[PDB]
């Protein structure tokens, strides 16, 4: 019964929310109102709450610390909750896969987001830790990057981000119970 760590990226506050670079909190949301955990203890710049998926403890986890700072509170918990490496899983927007897909890793570098950055760091700088990345495409025309990041989704990729979180919580619960890579399908 070692426990997982399931933490979605975001940055804290009204501001954000339902912006791109939140949805790894999205998905957290979501997997935590499935599994019937609630988020509301506060602890290592955290919001988390701790539950299980089938018979497996885990805990989720949306850090408060802006999106730069994140591993300054996942580090922390992982230690705190001896959750091993390889059950620390990072949930976060990708701008490198096409709005609303999926993709799962069991390790990989940060690919220039900031917050999968200072996770790694916050880790030791190890990067087998498995990874749900969820595709929000790149920047329109020239719109400014960091803009496109801190706007909402649009009407149309929100119906394809809502189709995504639904995938999402069947993934995470597979991955989490099954105890070499994997293809999503949804």
């Known amino acids: 019964y070692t426990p997982w760590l399931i933490a979605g990226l975001g940055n804290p506050g009204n501001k954000y929310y339902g912006t791109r670079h939140n949805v790894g909190f999205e998905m957290v949301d979501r997997i935590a109102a499935e599994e019937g955990i609630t988020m509301n ?28 700072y994140s591993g300054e509170a996942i580090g922390p918990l992982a230690a705190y909750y001896q959750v091993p490496l390889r059950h620390i899983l990072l949930i976060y927007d990708d701008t490198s896969l096409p709005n609303g897909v999926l993709r799962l890793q069991k390790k990989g570098g940060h690919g220039r987001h900031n917050g999968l950055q200072n996770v790694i760091e916050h880790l030791d700088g190890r990067r087998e830790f498995p990874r749900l990345s969820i595709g929000i495409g790149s920047p329109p025309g020239k719109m400014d990057p960091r803009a496109f990041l801190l706007q909402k989704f649009s009407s149309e990729e929100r119906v394809q981000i809502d189709t995504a979180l639904e995938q999402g919580v069947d993934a995470v619960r597979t991955l989490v119970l099954k ?8």
Do not use: C
């Open 179 to 186: 105890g070499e890579r994997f293809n999503l399908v949804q």
């Open 41 to 68: 203890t506060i602890q290592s710049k955290s919001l988390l709450g701790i539950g299980s998926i089938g018979e497996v403890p885990v805990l989720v986890v949306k850090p408060q610390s802006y999106m730069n």
